[PDB]
Amino acid sequence: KTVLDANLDPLKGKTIGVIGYGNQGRVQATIMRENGLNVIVGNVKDKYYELAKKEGFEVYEIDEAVRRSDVALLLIPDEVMKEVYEKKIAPVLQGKKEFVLDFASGYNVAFGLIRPPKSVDTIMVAPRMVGEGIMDLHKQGKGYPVLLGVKQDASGKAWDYAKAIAKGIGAIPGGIAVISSFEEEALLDLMSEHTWVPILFGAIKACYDIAVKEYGVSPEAALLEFYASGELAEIARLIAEEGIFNQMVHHSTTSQYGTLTRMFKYYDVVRRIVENEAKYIWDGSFAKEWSLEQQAGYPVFYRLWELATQSEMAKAEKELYKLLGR
Amino acid sequence: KTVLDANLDPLKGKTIGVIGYGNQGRVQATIMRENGLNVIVGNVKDKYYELAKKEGFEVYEIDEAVRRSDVALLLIPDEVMKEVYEKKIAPVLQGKKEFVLDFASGYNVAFGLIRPPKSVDTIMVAPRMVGEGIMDLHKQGKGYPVLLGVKQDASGKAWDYAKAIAKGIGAIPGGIAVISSFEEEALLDLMSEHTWVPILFGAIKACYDIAVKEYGVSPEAALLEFYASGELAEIARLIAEEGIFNQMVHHSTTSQYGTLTRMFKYYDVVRRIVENEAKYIWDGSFAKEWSLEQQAGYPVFYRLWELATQSEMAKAEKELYKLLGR
Amino acid sequence: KTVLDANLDPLKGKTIGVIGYGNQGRVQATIMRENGLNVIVGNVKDKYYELAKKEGFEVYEIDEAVRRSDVALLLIPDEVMKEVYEKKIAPVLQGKKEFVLDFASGYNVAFGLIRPPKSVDTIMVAPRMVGEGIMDLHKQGKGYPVLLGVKQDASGKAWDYAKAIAKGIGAIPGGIAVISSFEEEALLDLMSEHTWVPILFGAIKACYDIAVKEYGVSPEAALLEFYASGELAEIARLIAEEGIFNQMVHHSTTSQYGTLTRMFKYYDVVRRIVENEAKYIWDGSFAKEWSLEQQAGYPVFYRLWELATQSEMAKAEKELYKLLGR
Amino acid sequence: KTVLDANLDPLKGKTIGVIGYGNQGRVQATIMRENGLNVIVGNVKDKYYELAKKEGFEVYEIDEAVRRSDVALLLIPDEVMKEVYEKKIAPVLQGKKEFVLDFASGYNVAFGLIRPPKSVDTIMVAPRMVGEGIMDLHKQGKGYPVLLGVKQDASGKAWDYAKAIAKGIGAIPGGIAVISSFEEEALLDLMSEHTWVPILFGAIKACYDIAVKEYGVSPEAALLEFYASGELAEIARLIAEEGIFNQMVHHSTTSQYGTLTRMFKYYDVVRRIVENEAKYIWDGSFAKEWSLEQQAGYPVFYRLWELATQSEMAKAEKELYKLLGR
Numbered sequence A, B, C, D: 001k002t003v004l005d006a007n008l009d010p011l012k013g014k015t016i017g018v019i020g021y022g023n024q025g026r027v028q029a030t031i032m033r034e035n036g037l038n039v040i041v042g043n044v045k046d047k048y049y050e051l052a053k054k055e056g057f058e059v060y061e062i063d064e065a066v067r068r069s070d071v072a073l074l075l076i077p078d079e080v081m082k083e084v085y086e087k088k089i090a091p092v093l094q095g096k097k098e099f100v101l102d103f104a105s106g107y108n109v110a111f112g113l114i115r116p117p118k119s120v121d122t123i124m125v126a127p128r129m130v131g132e133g134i135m136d137l138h139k140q141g142k143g144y145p146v147l148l149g150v151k152q153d154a155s156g157k158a159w160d161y162a163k164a165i166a167k168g169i170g171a172i173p174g175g176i177a178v179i180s181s182f183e184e185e186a187l188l189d190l191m192s193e194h195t196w197v198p199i200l201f202g203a204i205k206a207c208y209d210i211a212v213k214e215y216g217v218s219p220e221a222a223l224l225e226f227y228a229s230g231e232l233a234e235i236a237r238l239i240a241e242e243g244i245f246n247q248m249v250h251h252s253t254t255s256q257y258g259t260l261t262r263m264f265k266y267y268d269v270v271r272r273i274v275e276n277e278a279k280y281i282w283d284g285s286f287a288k289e290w291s292l293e294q295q296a297g298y299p300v301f302y303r304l305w306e307l308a309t310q311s312e313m314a315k316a317e318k319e320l321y322k323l324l325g326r
């Protein structure tokens, strides 16, 4: 039901352009040069221009590297992807006949902010790691999971181009390739940022104001319990390797009774928050909200970085980290 | 306002018994034998009986090691601490004249479940690490934070006994010693288990049921986003070393806008949960609830481990971990 | 999908102990002695000690009858089952190698109050009759329904031991054997006692206080309508033989219009009571409530038998039954 | 705690440019030319181009007057300040080394709409008068209050540059200089426009509709009571000179009982409006609302000037002012 291996025969002998030499563009082009392809770097005249030339490539302009290529990969950030697509790549794709356009994110295509023509294939390969964990894993010989999806179907060879790049960048064999969509890629990525990450940061911030202002706990002793000691980054290492419920048997018996009995008690309070944030993404309403913040000139993003770093909990964290040598 | 150094002169030449050779007893007795004290092991006739004799000690009985000692340390778990105190140590402490009783937890004394006489000192030294991170730190020459507190004051040397054991087990110099209470030690330890740990596990469990049952995401692709990839144990390593708001500048600009604007929106919903769980602990009502679960014979603890490990999210995690080699 | 016949060949030639000679122990051991097995009685030195010796058996002690046996049946009440298991049977089961432990109830094992070792099989055969209707049925040659379930699986012959005792006590052939669980046996038994039996007794008690105190009906004429005439035990005999909706065509046409139109009107009021009482059982919360009533010394059970038998409806029932010769 | 005098020695001998010759630019440059500085006018080629040349100055271009200057003052309106800063002044400030940028408003800098470099000082001098009351008070020899604030601190001379312009434009000596912020300057200015000014205009508009439509008061007699007689501009002249509670003793005794007893009765109704409007400003949400009204092309500003000047209260005010000779 999931993919474990593929071919590399559909994409042999042809030119594989890579636009952008940022963080994701360096690792994915390094493992393709070892597998023996024709990989060229299309980069803006930047500081990355020299650092991609002395690493053993040939570097060009963006709209020129699409003219030579037959399969291009758009590894540039999502904030600048829209205004450099219409100015550089969009005049060139109408001068081609067949093309394969590849995306590492699913945000600008699921919400219709970038609409390629009908003469091109649009596929997606999306790694679930960070990039500074992938180069440190390629020396071993293992892989990493990816998510595949196809939006516009032109050739009939569309699904067998996507599996081959999953085997060309060093994900399979050794990892999992799951068949997904463009809309299910963008929903799951913006559900982590909206549902369980701001409830976690807002509950450690709320434990600090109840302990210090109501019960008279010292401001230097509340920090060492909640997050300034690395006990949250120790019980999270066991989740990745043993399970989420099976890492609980290495705790006290008093700890398992208070965690299990309260997880089932506050379950339908936090379920009503996830139902409302997933409806706000799926209709396209968050993509309109963040597209009008970038046009007003970020007035709310600026005032919420001021109110967070100049608070009571962050002003006391600064001194305690000026005392443990960090 | 906090302690950075102490002496070892009040506790030189005298016998320092250690009751229990579990996890916390092995590390704390090892760093005291190197500092040059008279450390004896009081252990039950167990599997730890041999393993503490071949490690270079002298093992005895529990009520005999209190007769020889003058400063005893009770590094035994809190579940069995009450019924082995009244049967072994309580008949002996009335036969002494002066004694220093030391506790690594603040649960049984803050709620009055163990009440020592008026002829004894009662102090507390409570390390904020795990034990399997402390022995791996002793070869460096560094320290770790501790919390000090005094319940019953007999000598007048009561506060200067507590600082010396903080320097005798290898915490200071190099770390922090914070002055605290027995009641503020037990409040902060049961606020992690009741407020932000079951909110976090119940929000990843609720993201899985909304994504799979409403939007048609695959059961093997929802797991790789939320917790089965080690991205929760990567962004938690930066919290311990850089801060909680300063680790966010290594994320995307779209990720900081969705985290900051929702952390301030769901702040008074999760603040009403922390106000109610801290009142339930401070009155002593959780200590009555967990003391009557152990007497009925754990009927609710047994039925909540069945309903958690036989759910929809844990039955699919078993298969995916039977596919990535874990 | 259900069982209609089995064998008796797995349990021939071996000793079948029966613990307790109460109501369920007398009937089940009588139909097994006729089928030709080795049935011994393990009874406390009681009044049943003589009455099981003159009925043609050999009576022993409880912990001695487990030493001789290989398949034991625990037909003792659930109130005393826990404190006579740990004192008598639990020291002996570790001295065996293979054993089959059999239960006629599913209460103490589903909620984890009795946890046998991993070296033993645990099965269940649960008859849905009374015992004083089974001995009066054995002369006919018919059967009665039973429920089978297996908790811990050791041999692989575990499911074929359970079917054979269903045929050995005289249930099949001629009746139904349904495959069930230990948790589904305890849920359905405590749903009759909590949902539809106290609603029925509390609605005849509420018809008596509205008729007598508001409309001036005589206290001796309200009783003869609601329950003191045997019409509730006449329309219930047709439910067992004809159906629950098909017994209504032997009533008046005015009676079927008032029963059908009000059964659909009060259906979601009584559905909210059953949803809440089934959640209170499944989590294990009723087993904690009844285990702490037996430890306080029954103070609420004593005061609710006083308030029920000294009420207005029970004081007037006493005189009317002192007038019809009952 | 407040400032009463300063120096003029940090800013002697150097060039003080003034951008814009509007209302605030004409008065502030006139009192600086008398104090003996080097004041040049940077104005757009406008109608003010001639009117600032015949008044005894030297007029230039905007980006040329920043090249000559060393301390520039931006006395231009806030609506056009953003799009003439990035086109003219922003290319020049990177060609300098040290500069002092001065602002008479705190709107565009507090909300991050104009972010100067790190090589420049940013200060603020904000007068609390009108401009057509300041020139009429320069012939007397008096002063007027101002608010000082510093955003980015570069040289260490930043706070003593701000006090000297407070003495150089003719505020101190004789007036008050209060030390404030950029965020506290923008909060207090938009709290007058949002809280107590639209409540006042909406309560005289609501007195007119209740008196005329319910009680049959003439439309020409309701106007002469509420605002068309100059009694609101008479009891407001005593607030500035005598107090807000001490001007009430020149009223009737019936008037003081109805004002005092209702001011304390409707106090928590109007306190809930001020709490909500001050949270909407501080987060930066009003700055996003007014920045997207100017981009849609003012569709709501146009329709609310139509609905206000074509109402029942403004159509009858037009005729009554066509009868008293106004």
Ligand SMILES: [Mg+2]
Binding pocket: A189, A192, B225, B231
């Ligand atoms: Mg993620």
Ligand SMILES: [Mg+2]
Binding pocket: A189, B252, B255
């Ligand atoms: Mg992302």
Ligand SMILES: [Mg+2]
Binding pocket: A225, A231, B189, B192
């Ligand atoms: Mg903790």
Ligand SMILES: [Mg+2]
Binding pocket: A252, A255, B189
């Ligand atoms: Mg603990």
Ligand SMILES: [Mg+2]
Binding pocket: C188, C189, C192
């Ligand atoms: Mg029943």
Ligand SMILES: [Mg+2]
Binding pocket: C189
């Ligand atoms: Mg029963």
Ligand SMILES: [Mg+2]
Binding pocket: D188, D189, D192
């Ligand atoms: Mg104002």
Ligand SMILES: [Mg+2]
Binding pocket: D189
């Ligand atoms: Mg203004």
